[PDB]
Design a protein around this ligand. Structure first.
Ligand SMILES: Oc1ccc(O)cc1
Ligand SMILES: Oc1ccc(O)cc1
Ligand SMILES: [Zn+2]
Ligand SMILES: [Zn+2]
Ligand SMILES: [Zn+2]
Ligand SMILES: [Zn+2]
Ligand SMILES: [Zn+2]
Lengths: 287, 287
């Protein structure tokens, strides 16, 4: 209830500055890489082995996994600067623009801009530009700096619309068997973006491109957390709307996907994080 | 103080069966794979990125990381069978044998025997033989069964001797700069096995061969925990001997390696596990 997560575009110049500086500190201390690694490791952890489900994606645990992910991350933010909370990128609103790359989120004082085509789409503006921000690859070894390539792919030329979000919120069931990419009438799978994909969450990843378009490397871009803060907001909206609806599956799903199964790489269960207000934060739209 | 960790050779037939059965249960539930993954993930987490140090190896955190690792693992054992504790493989005494492969640890009622050359060194005896125990590879996908190849490599034809262990215990300093594989006059690096390697801990891995000889895959073999229980046994002996010595580095080491740094993939610090008795277990030789 205490911590307010604000729309990025509604942040003050000081708020934008403080967040960035805090993220940079986390990076310098070595704390930020933990999250990159955590995300990568979970992607390789299949539930069960052989299937295309993993601890963090393509299954029911997708939403609670990332909520815990962001929760831990926001806590680390506060440990540096107690006035700093995790803001969210409301991409569905930016989709209304003729050129979403002109959105203030991509300004030099915050996330920085698109990749430079002349420099192989290396980001050379903002606080996370090359020579200011080092990235790591799939193996955990140093890369060559952050990359972005907005709407370059055929599959995801645009950002998800407000309509896309509203249609997702209409879904009655949190998730359906067989709790994977093939799940239908599943809010989880729809929001994740596999219903006629890439949509919503998956579409944003592919739209940004660079490290964000690739699962093991995605958190190398700070906008990852901004993205998923919005995803976690949409989920929280859905929960309030459908309060008679609960997490699925409760039982008999793959291990790691059930209501009280531990979510690798943590002992945290989906139940632990089903109530976001209990976790000590709220989105500004709730006020 | 409560949970007693016994020498494998001093286990009863009932104790051997219970341990094995519990491990199989852990495997079936999906809990065992978590530990394989945790280990693999930590190996890929370099401190700092660029160096050959990682969260679990080739650095000061090697010993406390695995102590926490075993602690969690033993807890999961207890959650299934409160009478089962983690035993240790005293390989230095098996080294005194003309043929260490004849040791009772490798009997069909416990760990099973060496790999079958006809079957590409797949283990076909004991409860963890092919078709009874499934393994996963570096990527997290099914492999095709446990492998072992005792003393096949030129570098590690034999197991470490009791003398090797005694010589390690004589080292006064826990670890030395630059806190890596090149650390000289370092108990940590000596016990780990990079001093004229492969020695001690590293040598045992290479001697067993199969998955055990490879970092990403090593915990696929249940003897991994028995091995490290002995490694974890030797350290406390060193601790008891050099009571005026403490963990190093306390400060100014790489992040993740200092006394009060979180050890990826956990929040656990080396300090948290410096006193093994405080953790609620003791080795039989201490009584
Ligand atoms: O972390 C990621 C999740 C989904 C994607 O489609 C790409 C990256
Ligand atoms: O996982 C492993 C760690 C260290 C070794 O020396 C061998 C395997
Ligand atoms: Zn506005
Ligand atoms: Zn994502
Ligand atoms: Zn992801
Ligand atoms: Zn290892
Ligand atoms: Zn080892």
């Amino acid at each position: 209830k205490y911590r307010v997560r604000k729309n990025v575009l509604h942040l003050t110049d000081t708020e934008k500055r403080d967040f960035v500086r805090t993220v940079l500190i986390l990076k310098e201390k070595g704390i930020y890489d933990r999250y990159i690694a955590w995300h990568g490791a979970a992607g390789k952890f299949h539930t069960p082995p052989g299937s295309d489900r993993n601890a963090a994606h393509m299954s029911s645990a997708f939403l609670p996994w990332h909520r815990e992910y962001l929760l831990r991350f926001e806590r680390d933010l506060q440990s540096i600067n107690p006035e700093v909370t995790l803001p969210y990128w409301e991409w569905e609103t930016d989709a209304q623009m003729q050129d979403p790359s002109q959105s203030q989120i991509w300004s030099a004082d915050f996330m920085g801009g698109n990749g430079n085509p002349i420099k192989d789409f290396i980001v050379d503006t903002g606080p996370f530009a090359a020579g200011r921000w080092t990235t790591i690859d799939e193996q955990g070894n140093p890369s060559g700096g952050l990359k972005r390539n907005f709407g370059a792919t055929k599959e995801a030329p645009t950002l998800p619309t407000r309509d896309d979000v509203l249609n997702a919120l209409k879904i009655t069931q949190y998730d359906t068997p067989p709790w994977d990419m093939t799940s239908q009438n599943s809010f989880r799978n729809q929001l994740e973006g596999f219903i006629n994909g890439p949509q919503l969450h998956n579409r944003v990843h592919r739209w940004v491109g660079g490290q964000m378009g690739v699962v093991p490397t995605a958190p190398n871009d700070p906008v990852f957390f901004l993205h998923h803060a919005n995803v976690d907001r949409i989920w929280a909206v859905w929960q309030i709307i459908h309060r008679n609806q609960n997490y699925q599956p409760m039982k008999n799903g793959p291990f790691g996907q059930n209501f009280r199964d531990p979510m690798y790489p943590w002992n945290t269960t989906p139940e632990d994080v089903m109530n976001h207000r209990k976790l000590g934060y709220v989105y500004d739209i709730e006020l």
